[model samples]
Target: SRPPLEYVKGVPLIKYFAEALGPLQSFQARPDDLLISTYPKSGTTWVSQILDMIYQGGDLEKCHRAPIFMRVPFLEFKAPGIPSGMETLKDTPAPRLLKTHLPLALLPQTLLDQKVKVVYVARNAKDVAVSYYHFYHMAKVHPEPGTWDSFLEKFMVGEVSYGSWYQHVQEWWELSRTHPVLYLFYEDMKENPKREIQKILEFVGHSLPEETVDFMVQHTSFKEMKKNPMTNYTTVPQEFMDHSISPFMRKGMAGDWKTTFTVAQNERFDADYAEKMAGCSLSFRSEL
Candidate 1:
């Protein structure tokens, strides 16, 4: 039997909505909101964690009670029992925190017009591809028998849910060029999270003392976040899991794609990426 829609990861059916529904069609967005935008599996969790820490006075414990989803709700993952999360966010207090996978073109117009603060996190596409491949199967959204080759083809054709990863990254990067936005590289966060986290705090108007900064760096490490159910999705609802899906928290390391994708696959991916993103000024960081 086919997996139920609830278990599916990519909403292939919603492709039309994502593509045609530009920022104008987006639900109400606030000006003072802090938006965390990223391609799927692109260190969004890490950015959310760091932002949570920065905003909540570095109080990791308080953040645990509210959970990341409640604080940084995903705009599109409005699954049942997920609480019409976006609607709840509409009236969230000023300087409210939010997370989304919507490309720049699809974000709410108010965000741009109001100059709401935005942080766009990007990972190497190779890692994102690997992470998403596993995620799709785990969510039981795609057929279990699909191969990487087939998935790669679909990804290239923008057949998956969030639309083309290249287009999403390019649009956000372009917006950052003129908007008051912060562009964060996942690799940089992985290499020196303390520095990056501090930089983010500075961007968001917080200044942590040295001792507190040290604690945050240690606390937000992959090992720590993986163990902390608050940061990781260990307790996600049963409906959210498929027998095939791995834990939502996969290895949060840079260069993981090196182990999964072959050299030839990498070459082909690069060629295709170059063709699609020819003139985009976005610079991707895959190393420390």
Candidate 2:
């Protein structure tokens, strides 16, 4: 069995996340803050590590100072015996790097008012669903995902935590049109890492030497992160994340949905997806 999910204005969230809502409403944002937003299981850690590396002038040693989540505080996370995101940010220094999976509607208004720079990363819907399914198994905070077929049905209907992927991606896409958002695709990041890193550097106004850029490229690779406990969530308590069920840093590639989605499911998902995304100009690639 899994924890019961609570709904806030129709957006399903875990109980702890729901509790954070009250405090989050009053949370402030600074103009210099950089927000890294992503749908869960959509390469959130990957991007955070890259950004941290850039900020550190590509010093791999500095990145080891703390876990990625501690370095880039997850803006809405709350749990027993752990400091809430808001609590952590209270003492954090200027030009802080923060992370969130919140959709635009739920994001802190101060981020917009202060014009904080946001890096929004979206993985293809099919891949997101596949990755999220496995995540729910190991992530005790979320509800029991049940069987794959049933989980897929719930996913299609926006019954999972964080709600509809279709709406999440599209709404953020619209925000980028007017806000200081650097919308990125996971597939694009994987396709050409150097190109994507350059885009991030230009967006965040950070300049790195070619050699340092090469160092970051090698350091943030999936293979390196998987073995590195700091980025792998191995530092988390076993009760919170049982890695034997599924590793947190599993498969960093795009298009793994092919192995999980049945032929019938893919067709159904594509049709529904097209219908939901019909009005949006944003597009995604499931594979490199």
Candidate 3:
């Protein structure tokens, strides 16, 4: 079982997710709406960029130039001074492409009732833990990561924001069984990006030419995104980014946990992971 979430009196939310409570709970979802859902650091942004590109009909320059958060607003993106993403979306036009790191249970019922197109992306838990630990320090709203071992333990217990990586994946994995979800894996995206892109296109009802898909793949590549301010999220306040410590778009490469996890740590994680994911048949590859 995952650790209890620290959230509002009646709401389930992560640390950086307070401001979005009202909108998330009360906001009505449209049948035509597209919701990109994922646990944090699970290639959510990368997929969001691709979805936006497809929505724009492979408009490379325009899609690449706009800030990611603005175009594909994080319904839960909030800080002391920043504007609410919910408010932003309220005014934005329909057939809106929005993103969320919220749990499935908390999402408005209208979405499920209306049968909106929901795309969920899952990444390996190990990488999600490591990347989230780094993100803890980089983003101010997050609690400090403490130490590697401490953070790892906390992560395993599902104490971090958005709760356990296992449950997040499990919820969505099962959710897809009943609904039409474009369930995507980060590892598959790494090995065969174009195929994944096409899969997404088919799910989202976009039938672009082969060349257009190729152009989008190139633009959303890690190498290309690192340079682009929008995808890299360099536009967010400098205080949010301590490049010396960690960048928002850090290494997209998989198996980063190998370098960070000790033999003993790996064993412990594997054992716990097995127990937590025991009955569930969902499997994740350790490498891309």
TM agreement with the true structure for every prediction: 0.87, 0.98, 0.94
Candidate 2 per-residue C-alpha lDDT over 1-288 given as tens digits, one digit per residue, 9 for 90 to 100: 478889988899988988998899998898899999988888899999999989888888988999898888888999988999899888788779999887777888899999999998989988889899999999888998999999999999999999988888888888888998999999988988999999999999989888878888898899999999889999998888989999998898787889999999999988998889887778888787
- Model 3, 18-54: lDDT tens digits are 6567666777777788999999899988998899889
Which residue pairs collide, candidate 3?
none
Clashing residue pairs in candidate 1 are: 7-139, 8-141, 138-245
Among all windows of ten consecutive residues in candidate 3, which has the lowest summed lDDT? 1-10
Provide the clashing-pair count of each candidate structure: 3, 0, 0
Q: Which ten residues in a row have the lowest lDDT in candidate 1?
A: 2-11
Q: Which is the better candidate, 2 or 3, if ranked by lDDT? A: 2
lDDT of the candidates, in the order given = 0.73, 0.90, 0.82
What's the lDDT for candidate 1?
Answer: 0.73
State the lDDT of candidate 1 residue by residue for 1-288, as single tens digits.
Answer: 333222123334343233333333666666667888898899888889888887888897777876677777666655445554555666467678888786655566777787888888988877888888888877643445279877777778766657678877777787877897798888888888787887787788889898999988988888888888787776667566553367777888787887877778878888998898787776776545
Ranking by TM-score: 2, 3, 1
RMSD of each: 3.9, 0.9, 3.1
Off by over 4 Å in 1: 1-26, 141-145, 242-244
